[PDB]
Design a protein around this nucleic acid. Structure first.
Ligand code: K
Ligand code: K
Ligand code: K
Ligand code: K
Ligand code: K
Ligand code: K
Ligand code: MG
Ligand code: MG
Ligand code: MG
Ligand code: MG
Ligand code: MG
Ligand code: MG
Ligand code: MG
Ligand code: MG
Ligand code: MG
Ligand code: MG
Ligand code: MG
Ligand code: MG
Ligand code: MG
Ligand code: MG
Ligand code: MG
Ligand code: MG
Ligand code: MG
Ligand code: MG
Ligand code: MG
Ligand code: MG
Lengths: 129, 343, 247, 205, 211, 132
RNA sequence: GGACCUGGCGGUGCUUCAUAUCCCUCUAGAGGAGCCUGUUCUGUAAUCGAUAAACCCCGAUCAACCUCACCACCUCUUGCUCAGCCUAUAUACCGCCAUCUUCAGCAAACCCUGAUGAAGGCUACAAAGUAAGCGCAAGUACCCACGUAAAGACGUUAGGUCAAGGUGUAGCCCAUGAGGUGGCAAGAAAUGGGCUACAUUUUCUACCCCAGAAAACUACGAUAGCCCUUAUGAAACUUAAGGGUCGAAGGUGGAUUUAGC
């Protein structure tokens, strides 16, 4: 919760999604019931902290694997990386570490979206002529 | 009295006695049961015993461009109508009596082995027509309850598979047996294992494992050997697509332990390509029917080792006394190698 | 009933960055309030109530728990205690619903004049099944007429007369007004109570505003709602049950 | 109750209202501005602002009332107060100038002192111990002391020992007896206190 | 672990006994198995803290001389109040002195208890009096003041039967004179499969002025 | 537990009409009366005869339009006119509904010696208020 | 036989509770007397059902004939009915209800944990639950937003009712059906509920609350007993009302127990 506000802003700024609140049972494994039969689930879940507030693995780590969602996760020395697809060993507590991660992911995500637009635009201009 | 008469629904609800202390706890059993019959089914508005022909109700209103008048069927003409309705009533009873018999399972009164069909189509236009469902266990579980005493629920174990390596199983629980079938078969389709098959007919190597107290020993077999395995394993193997295998179940014969013990062992089998990649050597198959011809079944994708595999003069592998006793002709059983139907 | 709009487009991407919380509107509000509290730090009752959960659940168009409601309110109070500016005040007032406080001040009857020009007021009172209508004259000698009879002849019971005395005595006006009242229904005590209420209401036209509030606080201007309760079937009375038979 | 909890009980006291504002404290000023916003119950028919109102006698009258017959209950009370006053005026005229100073002729002063002389300071409670009942002494609250004094006085006058004597003569005679620390009701007080002393050992319970 | 259970999944959770936590709690929530343990042990800690303050002269000279002994100390689960019990003395005169000093000390003691940062949030301590049967001394206070005034049907029930009523009853008469088997539930037979294996056979355009 | 005229909760598959879904205590609160006449007003006579006639007309129309009635009958009396308002299904051919209207109106007019009219409202299917 | 789970139970622990409520406290009662009425038992040729809480002025907002279903005698046989049966089974039922309920929970469809065991699924600075629907609630009725009604799910007691009516199953059909005449229903007793009393806060009269008399063997006290008249009816020692006569137990009721905010 020290970084809930920071993370939610980073998600909105990059045009992505954040879930920093209490994780209710079945958000991923029962999404069609909770959201609707046509709900689209995430294609990638990025964990800036892999543990919940009682020092157990975040339920979404297990449930992400169940739904065949790749997971990126910062894994500190007390975390379990077994089910994280792309683990990144690093400090998850220090404000400087977490701020760095948010800049890197925010920048990586924003750069890729602009690259996608550049290529598409070029591919269309060349297509007409 | 006309005013003491009731509707058909009221009369059947009373006569059937489906609500009551008899039907609450199944305190009453029904070898002979009153069956509801719709008595308005074959009845035509306007038709009565007297055989009157009312224009516009039971006969056409206009005949030859002129309005018909009130008429009455002759006594003989009415007997035919009455007889025809009785025959039509027995024909309807016989059409319902003619119901297609369904194939039995492992036994006549057993649920195990019976097909339940493909899982239901998912909400998002998902379909599973390629999958077949088989029942493995149907149990009556009795729960002691604080206020209602012993209640009866159903626990079902079903396995699903497409016959091409993809198979899974799930437990279903519900008060009704047919709701449990739906839960189990629909849930199992989301918990599918992929099982690798050698030449799409058998396992890649002998598999011997223990799950809890259930031991399962499986042997790779050649084509034409068939499925000589526990009837439950036979059922599961047809769903996976294994045609030739020997299996022996020892210890506790618990269906659930056997099912998940079987799926755990079949999902952790190393293929020949994995063996070649792990050891960086060729996998060469020697078949006695093909003589000394060496058949390379798998070659490593990465570099190929130059150092031969060490030849330990004597392997330190643990052997099964049952397998050894058989090879030495010291195994005597009247039940082994018995003639059985094709499986 | 108001219907929530689609929460994603054709490509399936949710519109709101908090979609996957399941409470995007609630958590978007908490996110906005938490952010304002931070900016203040970087920079540095009677007529209103907080909206109820059922009104918050409509501004957001979502379902909320009771603890969800509390956490949001605890966060707004934390925003008032700070040096909130104008921008931080229009926001809080969106969640303050004005609580209308009813006036308890007694309504004063008009002062009328008769053919002879004597000022008087008229009011009514009810006690049980008794209904009274009293005419209190501004000036008089203390005469009270009940259905044309002297009050001590109509009310031979001393307690019924003490009830007639109470309104005038409480404001120190014994022997200063003449009363002519009519009462019907009820018993002797109920009729005296109805006259007490009728006279007090009419007497309020001739006393100061502070005296009218003292009569109100003494229970002299409140209609007694205590009426006979119906008998219920299966029991001896309104409350008494039939004897629980010996077991 | 047909009154919602929002309804507050009425305060019937002329003095409380005429009290000047300056004498008021900041706490008493808040209570007065608060009641202007509160709902007030209608005053019961029993109590009024009359200067002759006595809440104790009104309570004694209700404890003597049988089946809602307040007229008879009130009649018996006023007949008792007249009987006490006449008995004292007869005792006064027949006495010497010295004794006259010690003779009380106010029936309200006699009534109150008669009851105060019957209030039991300590009482007993029946307790169960080992399948056996033993009474335990306990202090009595003020409400209970005043209740018992009235109940004992009314009970004694209703005793069948009195043959054909009207209630105003019985009650008036008992009040004047208790006024002088004499009578059966005073004995009931003395015995209750005496029984408490015996059961002091059991007071640990 | 020991027979005393310590398997709680949220063993790393930070115990937060405060008045604000009680308000921000699910109403459905009920105390868990090992939730009472922390309460039982936290109340014991308060007893330890209070006992040392009483016997150390530095806290207060008046308190030390009193030599007060705490009979019981149990906090409330609400987190609004704390119940502490001290043993009364024989002399009611002495009891007044102890209560008076304790009543005024409590306010300072609360601040002294805040010195222990672990228990910094200490609800106001309610120094109840018990262990000395204070009522019994209170009763004697009234007993001496109190004014005592001038000082000086059938044996049939015992038998256990109503022998008389029965004797009359016989006399009145004399006046006129002169199991099944229950099947095991698991073995109860069903026909659902036979009905299943027998078979289950329960078995558009619109026009104006049709013909 | 009270039983009178209460459709009991089931598994959510039982369609009930507005009338069937409201127990007796909702009569005059959420649902009206199925017959309107003056016999039950204070100072009015012949309540017994109107009641028997209503019981017959309900049974008569149930068996005269078998399987066609989609709801309870509403019986209205004005003067000596008797109006029967029925919600029926759209399964029977229109010729059969006209025959039964002519047949029922005439037979009932001679039976009770009053001008009787039958008003039919057709619905494609029974109107469902809720699924109990 | 081992281990575990559920339920039940514990002369099982702890904490908090019950608001007319388990105990004490408050008021009037019941338990004693007579009478009214129900039940039991006994009696009778002479119904039935309810019958611990949740039966006992209960089905009955009602039995002189009728009602009536009972007993005795006599009579009828396609029978008021395209017959009939108050015959058995409420442990086949519908219908309508009691009870906890002076409760707040039930629960389809999903999801997840326990290795996919029987089972379990809450933490708000939150840790796997989401939950339609039903109930509570809301709303409505009565004089308010109060109170009282009404409502009160699932389930528990194979609870009550085949004798409200209907009805499955079995049974009777010259009788287990139908009609007629007369008759039963008492009290040796026991017991539940109620009424009236034992009196002076009373009794009688006037009055409807400022009165006069009464007040212990001619008082208080029967709505009982006996006699007479009347009302209803075809029929009244019987049912009701009134009068006359009569003037009893009863002297404020042990253990125990009921109701009321
Ligand atoms: K247990
Ligand atoms: K009694
Ligand atoms: K039943
Ligand atoms: K029946
Ligand atoms: K039957
Ligand atoms: K009684
Ligand atoms: Mg860390
Ligand atoms: Mg067979
Ligand atoms: Mg009463
Ligand atoms: Mg009820
Ligand atoms: Mg008695
Ligand atoms: Mg019986
Ligand atoms: Mg029975
Ligand atoms: Mg019973
Ligand atoms: Mg007869
Ligand atoms: Mg008879
Ligand atoms: Mg018969
Ligand atoms: Mg039953
Ligand atoms: Mg209300
Ligand atoms: Mg009710
Ligand atoms: Mg409600
Ligand atoms: Mg039974
Ligand atoms: Mg017969
Ligand atoms: Mg008499
Ligand atoms: Mg006559
Ligand atoms: Mg006499």
């Amino acid at each position: 919760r020290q970084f809930s506000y920071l993370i939610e802003n980073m998600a909105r700024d990059c045009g992505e999604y954040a879930h920093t609140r209490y994780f209710r049972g079945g958000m991923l494994t029962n999404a069609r019931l909770l959201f609707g039969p046509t709900v689209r689930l995430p294609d990638l879940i990025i964990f800036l902290h892999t543990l919940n507030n009682i020092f157990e693995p975040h339920v979404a780590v297990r449930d992400a694997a169940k739904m065949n969602i790749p997971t990126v996760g910062i894994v500190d020395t007390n975390c379990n990386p077994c089910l994280i697809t792309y683990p990144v060993p690093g400090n998850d507590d220090s404000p400087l570490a977490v701020h760095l991660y948010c800049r890197l992911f925010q920048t990586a995500i924003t750069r890729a979206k602009e690259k996608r637009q550049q290529v598409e635009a070029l591919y269309r201009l060349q297509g007409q002529k | 009295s006309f005013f003491t008469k009731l509707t058909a629904d009221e009369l059947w609800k009373g006569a059937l006695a489906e609500t009551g202390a008899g039907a609450k706890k199944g305190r009453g059993k029904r070898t002979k049961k009153k069956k509801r019959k719709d008595l308005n089914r074959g009845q035509i508005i306007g038709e009565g015993r007297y055989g009157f022909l009312w224009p516009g109700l039971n006969v056409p209103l206009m005949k030859n461009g002129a309005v018909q008048t009130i008429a009455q069927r002759s006594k003989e003409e009415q007997e035919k109508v009455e007889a025809d309705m009785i025959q039509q009533r027995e024909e309807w009873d016989r059409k319902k009596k003619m119901k297609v018999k369904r194939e039995r399972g492992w036994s006549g009164n057993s649920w195990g082995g019976i097909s339940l069909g493909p899982p239901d189509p998912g909400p998002c236009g998902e379909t599973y027509e390629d999958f077949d469902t088989r029942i493995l266990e149907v149990r009556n579980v009795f729960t002691m309850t604080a206020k209602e005493g012993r209640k009866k629920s159903i626990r079902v174990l079903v396995a699903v598979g497409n016959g091409k390596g993809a198979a899974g199983f799930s437990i279903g629980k519900a008060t009704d047996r047919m709701d449990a079938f739906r839960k189990a078969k629909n849930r199992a389709v989301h918990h599918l294992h992929y099982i690798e098959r050698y030449e799409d007919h058998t396992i890649f190597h002998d598999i011997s494992l223990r799950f809890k107290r259930t031991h399962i020993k499986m042997k790779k077999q050649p084509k034409g050997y068939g499925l000589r395995c526990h009837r439950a394993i036979i059922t599961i193997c047809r769903l996976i697509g294994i045609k030739d295998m020997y299996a022996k179940v020892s210890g506790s014969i618990n269906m659930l332990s056997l099912t998940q013990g079987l799926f755990r062992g079949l999902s952790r089998q190393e293929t020949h390509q994995q063996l070649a990649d792990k050891k960086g050597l060729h996998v060469v198959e020697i078949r006695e029917e093909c003589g000394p011809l060496p058949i390379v079944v798998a070659s490593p994708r990465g570099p190929l080792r130059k150092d031969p595999e060490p030849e330990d003069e004597v392997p330190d592998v643990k052997l099964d006394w049952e397998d050894v006793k058989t090879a030495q002709g010291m195994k005597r059983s009247v039940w082994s190698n018995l003639k059985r139907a094709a499986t | 009933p108001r219907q929530r709009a689609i929460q994603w487009g054709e490509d399936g991407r949710p519109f709101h960055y908090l979609f996957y919380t399941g409470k995007q509107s609630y958590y978007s509000l908490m996110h906005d309030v938490y952010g304002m509290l931070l900016n203040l730090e970087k920079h540095q009752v009677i007529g209103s109530r907080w909206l109820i959960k059922e009104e918050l659940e409509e501004m957001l168009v979502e379902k909320l728990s009771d603890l969800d409601y509390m956490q949001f309110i605890r966060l707004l109070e934390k925003l008032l205690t700070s040096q909130c500016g104008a921008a931080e005040e229009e926001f809080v007032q969106r969640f303050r619903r004005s609580v209308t406080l009813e006036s308890k001040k007694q309504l004063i009857e008009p002062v009328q004049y008769d053919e002879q020009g004597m000022a008087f007021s008229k009011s009514e009172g009810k006690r049980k099944t008794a209904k009274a209508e009293a005419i209190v004259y501004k000036h008089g000698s203390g005469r009270i007429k009940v259905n044309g009879i002297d009050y001590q002849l109509y009310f031979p019971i001393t307690q019924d007369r003490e009830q007639l005395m109470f309104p005038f005595h409480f404001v120190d006006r014994l022997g200063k007004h003449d009363v002519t009242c009519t009462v019907s229904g009820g018993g002797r005590s109920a009729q005296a109570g109805a006259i007490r209420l009728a006279m007090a209401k009419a007497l309020c036209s001739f006393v100061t505003e502070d005296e009218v509030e003292w009569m109100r606080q003494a229970g002299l201007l409140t209609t007694d709602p205590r009426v006979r309760e119906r008998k219920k079937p299966g029991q001896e009375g309104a409350r008494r049950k039939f004897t629980w038979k010996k077991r | 109750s047909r009154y919602s909890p929002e309804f507050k009980d009425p305060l019937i006291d002329k003095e409380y209202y005429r009290k000047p504002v300056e004498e008021l404290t900041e706490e008493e000023k808040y209570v007065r501005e608060l009641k202007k916003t509160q709902l007030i119950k209608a005053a019961p028919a029993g109590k009024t602002s009359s200067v002759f109102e006595d809440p104790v006698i009104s309570k004694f009258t209700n404890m003597m009332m049988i089946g809602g017959n307040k007229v008879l209950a009130r009649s018996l009370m006023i007949q008792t107060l007249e009987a006490v006053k006449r008995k004292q005026f007869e005792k006064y005229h027949a006495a010497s100038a010295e004794e006259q100073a010690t003779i009380e002729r106010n029936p309200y002063t006699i009534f109150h002192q008669a009851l105060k002389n019957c209030e039991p300071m300590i009482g007993l409670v029946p307790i169960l111990k080992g399948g056996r009942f033993y009474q335990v002494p306990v202090p009595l609250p003020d409400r209970r002391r005043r209740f018992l004094a009235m109940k004992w006085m009314i009970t004694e006058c209703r005793d069948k020992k009195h043959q054909r004597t009207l209630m105003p003569e019985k009650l008036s005679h008992k009040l004047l007896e208790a006024f002088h620390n004499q009578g059966p009701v005073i004995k009931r007080k003395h015995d209750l206190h005496k029984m408490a002393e015996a059961n002091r050992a059991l007071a640990h319970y | 672990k020991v027979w005393y259970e310590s398997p709680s999944l949220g063993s790393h959770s930070t115990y937060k006994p405060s008045k604000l936590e009680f308000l921000m709690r699910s109403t459905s929530k009920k105390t868990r198995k090992e939730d009472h343990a922390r309460l039982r042990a936290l109340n014991g800690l308060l007893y330890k803290a209070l006992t040392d303050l009483l016997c150390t002269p530095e806290v207060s000279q008046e308190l030390y001389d009193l030599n007060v002994e705490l009979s019981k100390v149990s906090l409330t689960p609400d987190f609004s109040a704390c119940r502490a019990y001290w043993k009364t003395t024989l002399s009611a005169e002495q009891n007044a002195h102890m209560e008076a000093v304790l009543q005024r000390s409590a306010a300072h003691m609360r601040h002294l208890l805040m010195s222990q940062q672990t228990l910094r949030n200490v609800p106001p301590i309610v120094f109840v009096q018990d262990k000395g049967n204070a009522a019994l001394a209170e009763l004697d206070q009234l007993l001496a003041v109190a004014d005592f005034g001038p000082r000086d049907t059938t044996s049939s029930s015992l038998c256990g039967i109503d022998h008389e009523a029965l004797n009359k009853q016989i006399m009145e008469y004399k006046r006129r004179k002169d199991g099944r088997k229950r099947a095991k539930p698991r073995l109860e037979q069903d026909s659902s499969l036979k009905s299943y294996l027998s078979g289950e056979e329960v078995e558009e355009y619109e026009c104006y002025a049709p013909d | 537990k009270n039983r009178a005229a209460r459709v009991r909760v089931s598994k959510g598959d039982k369609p009930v009409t507005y009338e069937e879904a409201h127990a007796p205590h909702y009569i005059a609160h959420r649902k009206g009366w199925l017959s309107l006449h003056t016999g039950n007003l204070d100072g009015e006579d012949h309540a017994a005869e109107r009641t028997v006639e209503d019981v017959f007309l309900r049974k008569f129309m149930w068996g005269t339009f078998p399987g066609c009635l989609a709801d309870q009958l509403v019986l209205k009396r004005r003067g000596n006119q008797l109006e029967i308002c029925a919600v029926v299904l759209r399964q029977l051919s229109p010729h059969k509904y006209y025959f039964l209207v002519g047949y029922s109106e005439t037979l009932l007019s001679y039976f009770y010696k009053c001008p009787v009219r039958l008003h039919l409202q057709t619905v494609p299917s029974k109107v469902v208020y809720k699924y109990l």
